């Protein structure tokens, strides 16, 4: 038998709706005529060892499995291996997410969930950069309804970037796919020294403030990532060097709203370092003014006291706030968060300040929050100016 | 068709119980109990359906028309089977998602589950109606 | 001074919108000219001892306080006592209800609540049949908003019928009222022998059945009342005498629905007896098919048994039914109601039937209900035919 | 007007707490606590309002126009007072109704209470706005 021909398409098998594509077939040196057939369609597509078949515009009618075979002076050759030309610019795009977070431990395993609103779809995960066969749910097929597909991704080695895109297809037309989903980058966190995340605008933020979270490292990282726990994507800024060795990057989050209230961790890496450093200490950003329920701050014994007495600030509310927080004007440390306790019709939290000293003096305000979102606080209480006397 | 319809009814009611997604359901959804119960209820429905088809086939008294009708009946049966299988697979996927979420079930996840379950329930209803009508014409 | 004139309006002070009304004034025998003035309007209304002033159509402009005075040969008389002509056919009608029930103990006290959807209204309770001053909330005025008015009615003596009607008025126009509310009769229940209420259509009713509750007495009452606890009004049928002394009345409630499921008590009285007998024993009417949640009946040891064993019927459900009921086909007694008990994923109720006898045989069905409405039951379970053997 | 406005704010928030009609509120509504608290909060609002009026009257620098403005201010104050009194009376009436119901509060009763409270809250808001505008023009 003559060497069975080979079949390849440039630029690739997956071609968008409208984009041009040419399929090539390679046979023997003395080949007389090349014939490109299509599973389903007897008509040959389009038309000494290299023969091309060009398609000006990829349409749903050219999306299928093709096989080639050349005629020789002694007869016809073996049919070629099939090539699935796919049109991937049709159905609306699905949604790719990561479970549990975009950041994974190096060498760890995770799950990427692809999903669409309608049913009857078979999903395919394509890792950007790797020339692999389209990963279909059919290998682990499950009767679910076609709404979602869970793809287990793993071991996430840090030798390269892990970027993914998802498509879906109806079973009747297996070579006509949807629009590529928005890509997802997976970050392999490791054991390198952690950076430090420092807010520059106070503990509790009020709507309108320009939050700027500064990330910094002494090890000399070159690129920094900020991730708010619960999000699908992250922010990346390069690390400038104000001093030799010290590398810092300011993540200007801008005006604040409900979305800016959460826990942020920063990771540091290098242009050549695909892997990322251990996470930084969390920076919980608390957002005031997000609850219209009110809190009240009272001081017992009184706003006026003498050094050495027992002052117990009481933050109370008729609403069932899960926790009560305390802030002192001027202090940069996070607010003192204590749980609520039902007393005389009002839930409360006692912030004991005994014995009181000259340092305890100042303006105090209390807030209240629920455990549904522990970062969305209430409006501040009316200030209380504790005045201590020697 | 009373028997197969009664089994179908039990499946449907258990599915509504799951649709509520109350704390009891939530905890059972992570332990396979719900899925296995649904599987039992759908196996009964399918067995009984086939039994009813067989007994109706005895009562029957042209050939191509009859063959076509039998083909249609088989197609409808398969559809119902596939729909219940879909429901159960969607419930196994929810378990897996909660596990990949390290045991945490968000409200968003559950809202999506509910949305998908309502969509699978409508299909089941339509297919059931069609099957009943086909049994009638048979 | 001459005798001060008198003022009266026929047919009455309260006249509907459009209905005709004539006001009369009585002065001295030698009176020369009668003058009818109106608080607010200097113009006299319309025009030897009797002088009339007719109004063809009562309109919002004639609704006010009127005073009369006659001229004598020696001068003018004292002005009359005012007469408030009211137009009560304007604003929409309010709603009068009784708290806690239309049936009250004889000599007992109660509260009648009058209310409207809009605010800014002052309510007046008028007892039909009694010539009393309009009872306004202003005596016990409260800053509430004008939506409702609670009027305490009491001691309800049984020497007459207590029928009430309610009107309301805006403060700016105190003599222009609304449309009379639907009347409410209050029944004074006493200590006379109770009647007996017997259903004629089984314990648990399915939608479509014609419920007929038969009330009966041996004392010889002449009129019967049926009250469903929770309603504003009652049904009244006279008591025919099939036998001498025995008096019965069939309250045909007709096809059944959600509304027919409740507790019914019957009262018996006589045409001349304003008071009513003590209540009859309650007849709880249970309505099946009102809950789509399902229940299942199983017998343990089995549907087949021998006399002398221990059969325990189990009514179970995955839903949290508060109670489970048991009915036996053919039995007329009310269903056995037992509370639910969470077992193996299914809430259940065990109906013990040990030792079993020849009588225990029959078709059994179980239902389930919630405590929100203990009379709305579920669809019946699949029948279970217990078969005992000697 | 910060002080009187702050007192008004406290009244409003307690009123929203009552508007929820949760089991805690329900039990407090039968024991006079809620009504007395509201009375305290409205007394403070009225005292502070009068104080602010008095201090603004010192800052003022024709006669009939001024008299008219003072009359309008007084009218607006009275309206706010009446509105809060109305709220409190509606809450006392609910207590009485539940008592005449032998201690039983139906869902219907509570739905009606909520409806009426929302209607009294709108009036309060409008009148408060008008009062603020009048203080501004004064």
Would an 8 Å CB–CB cutoff place A218 in contact with chain D?
no
* C-alpha atoms less than 13 angstroms from C-alpha of A176 in its C-beta half-sphere: 15
Å between B8 CA and nearest CA of chain C: 13
Q: What is the token pair recorded at A309? A: 């007495």
List chain A residues with CB under 8 Å of B116. Answer: 119, 145, 147-148
Longest Cα–Cα distance of chain B, Å, equals: 61
Q: Rounded to a whole number, what is the distance in Å from the CA of A321 to chain B's nearest CA?
A: 21
Q: Report the domain count for chain B.
A: 1
CA distance to A24, A45, A72, B57, B70, per residue, from A3 (Å): 16, 22, 11, 57, 49
> Quick one: closest CA in C to B10, which residue?
C294
Question: Which tokens in the block code for residue A92?
Answer: 């609306």
**CA of A346: which chain D residue's CA is closest?**
D24
What three-state secondary structure class fits B119? helix
Q: Please check whether residue A319 touches D, CB under 8 A.
A: yes
The two tokens of residue A90 are: 């049709």
In order of A111, A138, B39, C379, the CA distances from B86 in angstroms are: 21, 14, 11, 28
Other beta carbons less than 10 A from residue C331's beta carbon: 14
Q: Facing residues of C378 across strands? A: C291
Q: What is the DSSP string of chain D?
A: -HHHHHHHHHHHHHHHHHHH--HHHHHHTTSSHHHHHHHHHHHHHHHHHHHHHHHHHHH---HHHHHHHHHHHHHHHHHHHHHHHHHHHHHHHHHHHHHHTTT---HHHHHHHHHHHHHHHHHHHHHHHHHHHHHHH-
Chain B nearest CA to C260, separation (Å): 26
Select from A186, A14, A190 the least CA-distant residue to A112.
A186
CA distances A286 to A202, A207, B66, Å, are: 10, 11, 72
CA–CA dist B50, B76 (Å, integer): 12
CA distance C275 to C273: 5
Nearest to D33 among A293, A319, A345 (CB): A345
Which residues are CB-contacts of B20 (< 8 A; sequence separation ≥ 6)? none
Q: Which of A289, A294, A298, A316 to mutate to test the interface with D (most CBs of D within 10 A)?
A: A294
Domain C289-388 is found in CATH 3.30.930.10: no
Under 8 Å CB-to-CB from B88, ≥6 apart: which residues? A143, B35, B38, B39, B42
Residues C140, C152: Cα–Cα separation, whole Å? 10
- Rounded CA-CA distance A212/C115 in Å is 58
Nearest to B28 among C293, C294, C345 (CB): C345
Residues of chain A immediately before an interruption (C to N > 2.5 Å): 47
The residues, ordered by sequence, that sit 6+ positions from C238 with a Cβ below 8 Å of its Cβ are C222, C223, C224, C249
**Residues contacting residue D70 through CB under 8 Å, at least 6 positions apart:** D57, D138
Helix (H, G, I), strand (E, B) or coil at B32: coil
CA distance C317 to chain B (A): 10
CA distance A333 to A204: 10
- In the CATH scheme, what is the code of domain A196-288? 2.60.40.10
> Please, are residues A212 and A264 in contact by the beta-carbon 8 Å criterion?
no
CB–CB of D14 and A318 under 8 A? Answer: yes
C325 neighbors C287 (Cβ within 8 angstroms): no
Which residue of C lies nearest to D121 if distances are taken between CA atoms?
C145
Residue that is written with structure tokens 């039995």 in the block:
C331
Local structure of C384: helix, strand or coil = strand
Give CA–CA dist A27/A69, Å, rounded. Answer: 8
According to DSSP, residue C244 is labeled S
Contact A160, A187 (CB under 8 A): no
Which chains reach chain D with 3 or more Cβ–Cβ distances below 8 angstroms?
A, C
Distance CA C134, CA D75 (A): 31
Q: Are D8 and D128 in contact (CB under 8 A)?
A: yes
Domains A90-189 and A289-388 share a fold: yes
B6 and C382 in contact by Cβ < 8 A? Answer: yes
> What does the buried/exposed string (b/e) look like for B96-117 if buried means 16 or more CB atoms within 10 Å of the residue's CB?
bbbebbeeebeeebbebbeebb
SS3 call for C259: helix
CA D98, CA D84: separation in Å to the nearest integer? 22
CA D15, D19, D23, D28 torsion-angle sign: positive
Instruction: Report residue A80 as tokens.
Output: 């070629």
Bridge partners, residue A83, by sequence: A66
Contact (CB<8Å) A143/B101: no
Q: Using the beta-carbon criterion (under 8 Å), do C119 and D120 form an inter-chain contact?
A: yes
CA separation for the pair A240, A221 (Å, rounded): 9
Angle at A23 between CA A22 and CA A25, to 5 degrees: 140
Give the Cα separation of A387 and A353 in Å (integer): 13
For residue C146, what is the nearest residue in chain D, using CA coordinates? D86
Helix residue ranges, H only, C235-278 = none
DSSP annotation string for C297-360 = EEEES-SEEETTS-EEEEEEESS--SEEEEEETT--SPPEEEE-EE-SSSEEEEEEEPSP-GGG
CA angle, corner C27, sides to C26 and C28, nearest 5? 140
Partners of A99 in beta bridges: A111
Q: Which residues, at least 6 apart from B39, have a Cβ–Cβ distance to it below 8 Å?
A: B88
For residues A230 and A235, what is the distance between their CA atoms, to the nearest angstrom? 14
Q: Would you say C62 and C84 are in contact if contact means Cβ atoms under 8 Å apart?
A: no
Structure tokens given for A89: 């610019």
Query: CB neighbours (10 Å) of residue A384?
Result: 19
Burial (CB count within 10 angstroms: exposed 0-12, middle 13-18, buried 19+), residue B24: middle
Asked whether the beta carbons of residue D13 and residue A293 sit closer than 8 angstroms, the reply is: yes
Closest CA to A366 of A282, A261, A293: A293
How far apart CA D86 and CA C139 sit, in angstroms, is 17
Token pair listed for B106: 């968000």
| Residues of chain C with C-beta less than 8 angstroms from the C-beta of D100 | 99-100, 110-111, 113, 150
Total residues belonging to chain A: 390
Q: Give the distance between the most distant pair of CA atoms in chain D.
A: 61
Contact A363, A328 (CB under 8 A): yes
Neighbours of chain A (3+ CB pairs under 8 A): B, D
Give contacts of A 95-154 with B, CB under 8 A. Answer: 99-100, 110-111, 113, 115, 119, 142-148, 150
The neighbours of chain C, by the rule of 3 or more Cβ pairs under 8 Å, are: B, D
Note whether A281 and A196 are within 8 A (CB): yes
D81 neighbourhood in chain C, CB within 8 Å: none
Are the C-beta atoms of residues A17 and A87 closer than 8 Å to each other? yes
Q: Name which of A98, A99, A110, A149 to mutate to probe chain B: the one with the most chain B Cβ atoms within 10 A of its Cβ.
A: A99
> Exposure string (b/e) for A128-149, b if CB count within 10 Å is 16 or more?
eeeeeebbbbeeeebbbbbbbb
| DSSP-assigned states of every residue in C174-231 | TTEEEPPPPPEEEEEE-SSPP-EEEESS-SEEPTT-EEEEEEEESS--SEEEEEETT-
Does residue A191 belong to the interface with chain B, where contact is any CB pair within 8 Å?
A: no
Q: Between A and B, how many residue pairs show a Cβ–Cβ distance under 8 A?
A: 48
For residues C380 and B9, what is the distance between their CA atoms, to the nearest angstrom? 13
Radius of gyration for the alpha carbons in chain C, expressed in angstroms and rounded = 32
Answer yes or no: do D102 and C100 touch at CB < 8 A. Answer: yes
Q: Which two tokens mark C230? A: 């929770």
The answer to whether C62 and C82 have CB atoms below 8 angstroms apart is no
Segments forming the whole domain that contains residue B5: 1-138
Region of C31 (left: φ > 0; alpha: ψ -120 to 50; beta: rest) is beta
Strand (E) or helix (H) holding B92: helix B63-100
Q: What is the DSSP letter of C234?
A: -
| DSSP secondary structure code for residue C140 in this structure | G
> Which chain A positions have a beta carbon within 8 Å of D16's beta carbon?
292-293
Dist. CA C271–CA C222, nearest whole Å: 6
Distance from the first to the final alpha carbon of chain B: 12
Long-range contacts of D128-135 (CB under 8 A, 24+ apart): D128/D8, D128/D80, D130/D76, D130/D79, D131/D49, D131/D73, D131/D76, D131/D77, D131/D79, D131/D80, D132/D1, D132/D5, D134/D69, D134/D72, D134/D73, D134/D76, D135/D1, D135/D52, D135/D53, D135/D56, D135/D73
Q: HEC profile for chain A? A: CCCCCEEEEECCCEECCCCCEEEEEECCCCCCEEEEEECCECCCCCCCCEEEEEECCCCCCCCCEEEEEEEECCEECCCCCCEECEEEEEECCCEEEEECCCEEECCCCEEEEEECCCCCCEEEEEEECCCCCCEEHHHHCCCCCCCEEEEEECCCCCCCCEEEEEEEECCCCCCEEECCCCCEEEEEECCCCCCEEEECCCCEECCCCEEEEEEEECCCCCEEEEEECCCCCCEEEECECCCCCCEEEEEEEEECCHHHCCEEEEEEECCCCCCECCCCCCEECEEEEEECCCCEEEEECCCEEECCCCEEEEEEECCCCCEEEEEECCCCCCCEEEECEECCCCEEEEEEECCCCHHHCEEEEEEEECCCCCCEEECCCCCEEEEEEC
Binding residues of B for heparin: 120-123
C319 part of contact set with chain B, CB < 8 Å = yes
Q: What are phi and psi of D130, to 5 degrees?
A: -60, -45
- Give bridge partners of residue C248 from the DSSP assignment: C216, C240
Cα–Cα nearest to C64, from C47, C79, C42: C42
Chain breaks in chain D (C to N over 2.5 A) after: 61
- Tokens representing A304 are 């006026």
Contact, A173 vs A63, CB < 8 A? yes
The Cα A381–Cα A367 span in angstroms is: 6
Pairing of strands A304-306, A384-389: parallel
Residue D102, token pair as written in the block: 């032998």
Please give the CATH number for the structural domain made up of C6-89.
2.60.40.10
Q: Using CA atoms, how far apart are residues D89 and C352, in angstroms rounded to an integer?
A: 55
**Cα angle for residues A387, A389, A390 (degrees, 5° grid):** 155
Contacts 24+ apart (CB under 8 A), D101-110: D101/C99, D101/C100, D102/C100, D103/D30, D104/C100, D105/D26, D110/D21, D110/D26
> Dihedral of CA D10/D16/D19/D24: which sign?
negative
| Spatial contact of B44 and B50, defined as CB atoms under 8 Å apart | no
Nearest CA in chain C to D89: C144
* Chain breaks of chain C after residues with C–N above 2.5 Å: 47
Instruction: For chain A, give every domain's residue range.
Output: 6-89, 90-189, 196-288, 289-388
The Cα C240–Cα C250 span in angstroms is 9
Best residue of C291, C293, C294 to probe chain B, by most B CBs closer than 10 Å: C294
Backbone phi and psi for residue C100, each to the nearest 5 degrees, phi listed first: -100, -25
Q: Degrees (nearest 5) of the Cα angle D82, D87, D90?
A: 120
Backbone φ, ψ for residue C366 (5° rounding) = -120, 150
Measured CA to CA, the distance from residue C344 to residue B24 in angstroms comes to: 12
Residue of C95, C96, C99 best to disrupt the D interface, most CBs of D under 10 A: C99
State phi, psi for A274 to the nearest 5 degrees. Answer: -65, -40
Q: Test A294 with D10 for CB contact under 8 angstroms.
A: yes
Q: Are C7 and C21 in contact (CB under 8 A)?
A: no
Ligand-binding annotation for D71, yes or no, is no
Q: Which of B6, B9, B14 sits opposite C318 (nearest CB)?
A: B14
Q: How many whole angstroms separate alpha carbon A223 and alpha carbon A227?
A: 14
Looking at CA atoms only, how far is residue A333 from chain B in angstroms?
A: 31
- Nearest CA to A21 out of A112, A89, A85 is that of A85
| Contact between chain B and chain D (3 or more Cβ pairs less than 8 Å apart) | no
Range D57-61, long-range pairs (CB < 8 A, 24+ positions): D60/D138
Residue C79 burial (C-beta neighbours within 10 Å; 0-12, 13-18, 19+): middle
* C273: preceding bond cis by omega (within 30 degrees): no
Q: Rounded distance, CA A193 to CA A218, Å?
A: 9
Q: Name where chain B breaks: residue before each gap, C-N > 2.5 Å.
A: 61
On whether the CB atoms of residues C11 and C87 are closer than 8 A, the answer is no
Start-to-end Cα distance in chain C: 107
Calculate the alpha carbon distances from A302 to A288, A299, A331, A384, C312 in Å: 26, 5, 21, 10, 69
Tally of CB atoms within 10 A around D116: 24
Which CATH fold topology does A90-189 show?
A: Immunoglobulin-like (2.60.40)
């Amino acid at each position: 038998p003559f060497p069975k021909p080979t079949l390849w398409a440039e630029p690739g098998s997956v071609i968008s709706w409208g984009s041009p594509v040419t399929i090539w077939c390679q046979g023997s040196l003395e080949a007389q005529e090349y014939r490109l057939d299509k599973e389903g369609s007897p008509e040959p597509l389009d038309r000494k060892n290299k023969a091309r078949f060009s398609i000006p515009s990829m349409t749903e009618h050219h999306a299928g499995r093709y096989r080639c075979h050349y005629y020789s002076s002694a007869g016809w050759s073996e049919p070629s291996d099939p090539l699935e030309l796919v049109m991937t610019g049709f159905y609306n795009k699905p949604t790719l997410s990561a479970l549990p977070s975009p950041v994974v431990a190096s060498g760890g395993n995770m799950t990427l969930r692809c999903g669409s609103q309608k049913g009857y779809h078979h999903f395919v995960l394509m890792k950007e950069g790797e020339h692999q066969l389209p990963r279909t749910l059919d290998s682990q097929q499950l009767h679910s309804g076609g709404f979602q597909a869970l793809f287990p991704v793993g071991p996430v080695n840090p030798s390269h970037r892990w970027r993914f895109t998802c498509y879906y297809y109806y079973m009747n037309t297996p070579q006509v796919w949807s629009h590529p989903s928005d890509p997802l980058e997976i970050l392999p966190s490791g054991v390198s020294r952690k950076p430090s995340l420092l807010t520059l605008q106070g503990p509790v933020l009020a709507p309108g403030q320009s939050l700027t979270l500064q990330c910094g490292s002494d090890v000399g990282y070159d690129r920094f990532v900020l991730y708010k726990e619960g999000e699908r994507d992250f922010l990346q800024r390069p690390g400038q060097q104000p001093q030799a060795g010290l590398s810092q990057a300011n993540f200007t989050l801008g005006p604040v709203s409900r979305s800016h209230g959460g826990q942020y961790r920063c990771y540091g890496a290098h242009n050549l370092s695909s892997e990322w450093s251990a996470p930084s200490d969390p920076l919980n950003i608390l957002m005031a003014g997000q609850i219209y329920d009110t809190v009240s701050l009272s001081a017992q014994p009184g706003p006026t006291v003498a050094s050495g007495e027992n002052v117990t600030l009481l933050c109370q509310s008729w609403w069932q706030f899960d926790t009560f927080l305390l802030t002192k004007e001027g202090a940069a440390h996070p607010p003192l968060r204590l749980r609520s306790m039902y007393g005389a019709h009002k839930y409360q939290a006692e912030f004991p300040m005994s014995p009181v000293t000259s340092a305890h003096a100042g303006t105090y305000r209390c807030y209240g929050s629920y455990s549904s979102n522990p970062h969305l606080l209430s409006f501040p209480s009316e200030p209380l100016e504790l005045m201590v006397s020697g | 068709g009373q028997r197969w319809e009664l089994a179908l009814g039990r499946f449907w009611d258990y599915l509504r119980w799951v649709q509520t997604l109350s704390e009891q359901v939530q905890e059972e959804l992570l332990s396979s109990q719900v899925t296995q119960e649904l599987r039992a209820l759908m196996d009964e429905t399918m067995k009984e359906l086939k039994a009813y088809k067989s007994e109706l086939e005895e009562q029957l008294t042209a050939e191509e028309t009859r063959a076509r009708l039998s083909k249609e009946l088989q197609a409808a049966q398969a559809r119902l089977g596939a729909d219940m299988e879909d429901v159960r697979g969607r419930l196994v996927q929810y378990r897996g998602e909660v596990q990949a979420m390290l045991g945490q079930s968000t409200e968003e996840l559950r809202v999506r589950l509910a949305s998908h379950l309502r969509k699978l329930r409508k299909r089941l209803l339509r297919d059931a109606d069609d099957l009943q009508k086909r049994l009638a014409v048979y």
